[PDB]
Amino acid sequence: HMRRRPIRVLSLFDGIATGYLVLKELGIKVGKYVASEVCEESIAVGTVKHEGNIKYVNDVRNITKKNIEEWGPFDLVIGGSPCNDLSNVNPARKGLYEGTGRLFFEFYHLLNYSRPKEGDDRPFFWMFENVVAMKVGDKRDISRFLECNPVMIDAIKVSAAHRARYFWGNLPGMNRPVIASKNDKLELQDCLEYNRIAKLKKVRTQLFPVVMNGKEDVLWCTELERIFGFPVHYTDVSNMGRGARQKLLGRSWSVPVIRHLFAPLKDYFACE
Template identity: 30%
Template sequence: MSLFDGMSCGQIALNKLGIQVEKYYASEINVHSIKITNKNFPKTIQLGNVEHLREVELRELGKIDLLVGGSPCQNLSIINIDRSEHSQGLDGEKSKLFYEYVRALQIVKPKYFILENVESMSNEDRDVISKVLDVEPIMIDSALVSAQDRKRYYWTNIEGVEQPKDKRLVLRDIMEEKVDSKYYYERTYDPLDLSKKIVTRLHLNTHDLLKRVYNENNKCATLTACRGGYKQKKVYIENENKIRRLTPLEYERLQTVPEGYTEGVAEGHRYNMLGDGWTVDVIAHILSFMK
């Protein structure tokens, strides 16, 4: 069972490990994410809004071996540009959905569980989650398995999870060679410094995070849910002396999602669900410790 299933990265991870899934129950409300899940895994049983799942319905599902979920982090993450949503912690409108995960966990009593969330939350929120789940989180940075920095906490009762091996990937390793001209920016920018991870800033009248242009010889910063409006991550292409945004395919590679997996919805939705999603290889790594 997967709560806040998004585009079903949990299912991709199980699939990558060759684990046969008898039934995969998903709770998700975003129609675009559901469309992508159903395209790739037509047998997924969609349960709808987690808040509407009544106890009796959960019990009727029968034995659940594995419960996974990455509850929304808008109120926990420091990477949220909209300050009004930030700092409310676990009581925030979106992040309090964590308690729906706890409710399901207590009802279905799965053999294994994984809860994922941002590493940038407050220590108080982290400790509340650890206390409620009765386990300390393991912090894994997706940078070990991909070309993206993404520090996340994973609370799990799967024992003996170690850190994945470092694949030492950088942006250049996952970038497409030729991309459409629509991905390039014609904007001016600050002087370049190729020794830095952020090589320059585009001249845009917006939040500093959105101006940053990354070095192709380094890691990309954490992908976040975004639709358009200059929100995608940007990279400087040295041999072209040009700046462009990353493509949806590059976002897929940064999350170790199979290539083309999110095709079938508008590009904005692809970036959005990939920014919201899991790094599949981290989840597969954790699941590989199941007995």
């Protein structure tokens, strides 16, 4: 029997630090959070919104077997590799073995380095995420390398957006049913600013979802942030304009989904 200690995380393709935000708002103490990420606007959101508690290490293809020993041990390894080469939305997508799709094998590679060796029964948790709209042979091949089948969690149950994703991993209770919270904003109108009216009740991924003063309009950054369950102004960082912020949020994890998946980790690590 071992006393609770703060959690040590390795986040590949970390984006805007969703994994750290969910862990902190869950009250889990974070001893170490090594994020691997290359987008400078992305790094900036995480750097200031979490006050340099994240250790950025850049390109996932330059992380070495000895980097994983030095930085580790890790109690949790998470990743959601880029998707627009595995999505059937993309007509010009190159699949799991070309383009940015082969970045999955980097997560698979680093996972095994991160994994405890034989004789080490210490807890080790990991989760990998990608899009539901893949070729079935890609879904199979990812399941074969990770040695497990995915769970399908759609953010619609907990947010106001259609966001169906697969989650592979070994987190406690990934299969348990997803239950929405009182604070979740389930309908779009729950995310809109003053004097703005929602055309539909859930947004998908209409190009003008809102009507203001009897006239169409696009969503606002502050509104997108609420749709993805992020704090308002979470991406008001480093003079980023509209186009940058909505790109980061478009690549993002829906935070209530992650809150759902990471929530059992409270019973395994030191908490405030």
